[PDB]
């Protein structure tokens, strides 16, 4: 079909790379996971109740937080209905069902409530406190305002129409390493490991021989491994050094059909630079030209060869029970692995075990791999047992080679509610590299989880374009994702998305077309190419990507502008194109090169999960974790927080360009933008909480040395920080910045004391206290992010700092002492570190 073979091109254009091009494949693999994918995709297509797809209600099954009780009248819950202009108020109890909120207007004075200026239905049997669009309102003060209209059509969505054993053989397993050569330039080896999650099976080598261009061996590496022992989700992982490492390139010992990798073999190798993600990859190198490749050598006869309790002491109980209790970063020795097998299914009963218990495992043993099979069928407790995301994501880890011990995690996260899976969904998609293989049951699950609701599937859309936009290494297996995905949101989605590119791939050329100039002359062009891009280019609307419930109108040029940045972002403002807008505020987005904006994603995600953590104990620590959608490499945009300066700048009005910080300044800007001094104190209440929560959420990232330029505040008092990558994405301390500027506001002086301090410390010691009780999701989280998305920091030595910090170990009172002492740091320090930074930052 034309139709069906332009469709193709479509989907191609909205990847982002072309998935039908077998090029840099050696192998079927992704042929084989379309073709895999077909199902699930036409299954959860077929399950989902067309109408409650087509309104998509963003809805959670969460209590009610104290926050937003405390902040009620008298269970009245405020609603404002508009049509034509006719607005009108209803008494509301918040168990109201919003199917009965119209048994309530039919009579008590068929169609939907849509919210006012936004694609947000309140749909479906669901109490009404359970939307997420009511929480946000109780929390900001604000009328919940919606206009009656029509549900949209779900035929508007409708998708476009489709139609011998391994175990038998001793001998010692080996590789033929015919040799190397890259087109252009020594000693030089070739390294052989035979690996399983991260587990090195058996190592071998070839004679250093001199580096020519072209340099060969016909040598037979023998390992000690027998074929009959070699586990599902093996590497053969190639590498050349000289001591120093240059190239790497991968290949599963066993494909996705079972069989016993045979034939002739030539990999295009990945280079180094300057531990991650990118040294797991199954994909080789696509630029020919330029990389470095390996030819090999696999047996090949006849020969498709496939692949098919008691008592305990009490000192080995307590140093059992130890071991499990011990963090996800801290190591086992030997004796530890040796202690968890022997002892395995007394190890079963704590699903918290889990990780330990099947990383001592002897993976490179056919006997053990089929006892810890028989281990896995007594999963009861584990299936029981209440689901632990952090205990679920440290089985999707680096760690984890088998699928049926990542399967387990997979099965874990099925009773996850939509809600849940957007907090997890940008991590879940970066566990997707540490798959062996392209089709998986998190691949599957990822899929299941966007085709079945709008949201999830929207961000699940950018995260993976993001991915396949800048990822050599991950983008194949990322393009079949997207492509299964894209074939079954509907057309409705399918169009939606086209404007979306066509918009943001306009002005991304726009963006760096800007940046070809380093001024009045810049003001010009800007405002003229927005011009250009206004008649018959940008259609017009689109959704907003970091909000998909926004549509963004026509570009209101007189607001736009180039900033005064080294890499000169642009700030673009759009009108909101929706009428029933209850307002005229523009829409505010950055676009800019330069910022490791996938960096800035990681962190305000961790952000989000730290602000739920806090949500399970009545506390809001106000945090403004921005929109930020990566797009590419060193590109995104970014959503601008309205009616906010930076510390920096609000410094540089009343001493300008110094350092002569004046501790009197941020509260006197305050009471400048304040309208009453009812305002003011609640614009000083929402600093002590804004600062208290990055203060924490920073020290324990360990991002908290920040610069000046780099932490904003609202003029209604909400402090944050920004450019997340501009730290450890290219890095005297302080802990966090709690300066004299700060602490002026909260009503201290240097070294004195006042209620909204006390305060302070209350709310960063519950915080702080909050936060190591999820020590090991923090750990998990913070450990897949540095191995995903921080090019270079790894080492591990960046990792086990979050340990530091988490004082993992420690009782309460210990970790509470801590906190209070790294409080004093700042209080020790005051301008010490801010001067070094504007000495640095500013001058050199
Ligand atoms: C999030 C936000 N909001 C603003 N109002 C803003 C205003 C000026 C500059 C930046 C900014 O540079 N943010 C970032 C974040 C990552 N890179 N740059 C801003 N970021």
New binding site residues.
Partial sequence: SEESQAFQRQLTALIGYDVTDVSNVHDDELEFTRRGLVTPRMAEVASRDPKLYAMHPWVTSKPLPEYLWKKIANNCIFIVIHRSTTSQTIKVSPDDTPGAILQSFFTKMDFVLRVCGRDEYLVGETPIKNFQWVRHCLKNGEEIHVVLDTPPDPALDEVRKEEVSLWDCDRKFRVKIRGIDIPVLLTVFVEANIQHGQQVLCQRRTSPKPFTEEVLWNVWLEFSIKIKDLPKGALLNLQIYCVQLLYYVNLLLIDHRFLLRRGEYVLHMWQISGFNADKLTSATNPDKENSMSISILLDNYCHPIALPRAEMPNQLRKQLEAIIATDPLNPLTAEDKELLWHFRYESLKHPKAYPKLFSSVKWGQQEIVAKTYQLLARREVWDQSALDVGLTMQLLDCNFSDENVRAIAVQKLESLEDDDVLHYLLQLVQAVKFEPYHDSALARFLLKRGLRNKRIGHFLFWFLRSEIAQSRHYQQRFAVILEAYLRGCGTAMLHDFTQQVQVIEMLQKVTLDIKSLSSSQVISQLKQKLENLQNSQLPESFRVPYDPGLKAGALAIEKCKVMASKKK?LWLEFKCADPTALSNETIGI?F?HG?DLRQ?MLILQILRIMESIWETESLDLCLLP?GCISTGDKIGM????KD?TTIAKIQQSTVGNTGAFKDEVLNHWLKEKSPTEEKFQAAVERFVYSCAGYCVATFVLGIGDRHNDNI?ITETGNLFH???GHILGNYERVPFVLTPDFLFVMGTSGKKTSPHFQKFQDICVKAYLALRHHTNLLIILFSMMLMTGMPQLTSKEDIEYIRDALTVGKNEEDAKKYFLDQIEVCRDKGWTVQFNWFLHLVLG
Avoid at 638 to 641: S, T
């Fill in positions: 972002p950055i800019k910022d800035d921005y970014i959503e601008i927080v906010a904003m920004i450019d997340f």
